[PDB]
Nucleic acid binder design. Structure first.
Ligand SMILES: [Zn+2]
Ligand SMILES: [Zn+2]
Length: 374
DNA sequence: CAAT
């Protein structure tokens, strides 16, 4: 039995119009949901597959997530009980009602695990919808943003492409990174402690890997005092090159600069701080210096674990960044501890500093000062 | 992890 025999594949124009992942997208009156039900073993065809659709308004009871729940209840009565792995590709993330219904269903049934790939985040800026996605995640649903691979898979399985291959729309990768970072913020995703310790150790770097992790937070000026702005706190990393994502990669500092306009900050004074495992290369620093030159109400503070020699003009880039008003400093014990406490999935464990932390911070601080004073 |  093949997916083509299980579903009526949707029209290609229905798929592309409904699954376009522009984060802010008006005019869509419908939610689409493609799903597969599998055993514990993921290889081969699913046990069954279905496409559900429902109008957003006026009744959530006809949203495709609830249509799925009613179909799946009846389907299970007709098949021999076993453990099920369910995958959804949904055009909009769940509204508050569906999120709470699915969360209740998952939490009462240890035999079912659910992964939800979403094309767009629905009302991601509204606290009610944020809290509902957290309840769904806490019920064990794995919630991810649809990337190129999932759009292509959904095209192959659920669309009447007539053998033509999936063609990505404009800016699919840029949309993905904005949504991924936004989903991480609202789920309050914390960084793996091993990933933190490995990447923020400031001893001389000996690994062949060049990856950059970047933790960020935002403050607002209020009554001559900086106050936390808890909505936009999290971490991200560089995007490795891939011809279906960013063909030349996208460095962490640039992904961070992409986020700031997406936050829709008002005209008040803001201080945006990042803790990055590598200081920015020349290209990143130029872009960062351009940004702060053009956004006078945003103050940048950059704390770096290590100084990245890009074999080019990185020293001049750091000088330009400082000249244009960014604060640049090397992370000391206090900044390492703050990120462990704030951004890392530490499970109550205190910060344990690696060997030579203080000594390496002093050496790097002296190198930075020498760079900035030329 | 299809990898400037
Ligand atoms: Zn709903
Ligand atoms: Zn860079």
């Amino acid at each position: 039995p093949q997916i083509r025999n299980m579903v009526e594949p949707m029209d290609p124009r229905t798929f592309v119009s409904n699954f376009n992942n522009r984060p802010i997208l008006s005019g869509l009156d419908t939610v689409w949901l493609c799903c597969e039900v599998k055993t514990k073993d993921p290889s081969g065809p699913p046990l069954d597959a279905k496409i559900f659709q429902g109008k957003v308004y006026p009744k959530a009871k006809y949203h495709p997530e609830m249509r799925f729940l009613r179909w799946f209840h009846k389907w299970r009565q007709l098949h021999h009980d076993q453990e099920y792995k369910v995958t959804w590709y949904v055009s909009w993330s769940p509204c508050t009602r569906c999120a709470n219904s699915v969360a209740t269903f998952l939490a009462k049934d240890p035999k079912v695990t659910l992964t939800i790939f979403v094309a767009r985040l629905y009302y991601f800026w509204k606290p009610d919808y944020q809290q509902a996605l957290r309840i769904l995640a806490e019920a064990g649903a794995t919630m991810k943003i649809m990337n190129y691979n999932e759009f292509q898979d959904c095209w192959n399985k659920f669309v009447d492409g007539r053998g033509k291959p999936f063609k990505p729309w404009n800016n699919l990768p840029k949309h993905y990174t904005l949504l991924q970072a936004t989903l991480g913020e609202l789920l309050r995703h914390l960084m793996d402690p091993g990933t933190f310790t490995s990447n923020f150790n400031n001893k001389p770097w000996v690994s062949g890997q060049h990856e950059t992790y970047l933790c960020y937070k935002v403050e607002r000026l209020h009554n001559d005092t900086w106050v936390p702005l808890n909505q936009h706190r999290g971490f991200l990393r560089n995007q490795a090159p891939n011809i279906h994502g960013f063909p030349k990669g996208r460095h962490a500092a640039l992904c961070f600069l992409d986020l700031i306009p997406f936050w829709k900050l008002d005209g008040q004074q803001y201080r945006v701080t990042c803790f990055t495992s590598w200081s920015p290369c020349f290209s990143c620093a130029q872009e960062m210096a351009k940004f702060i030159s053009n956004n006078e109400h945003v103050s940048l503070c950059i704390f770096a674990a290590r100084i990245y020699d890009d074999q080019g003009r990185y020293q001049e880039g750091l000088r330009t960044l400082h000249r244009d008003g960014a604060k640049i400093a090397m992370m000391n014990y206090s900044e390492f501890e703050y990120c462990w406490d704030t951004f890392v999935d530490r499970q109550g464990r205190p910060f344990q500093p690696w060997d030579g932390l203080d000594e390496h911070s002093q050496a790097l601080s002296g190198r930075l000062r020498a760079i900035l004073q030329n």
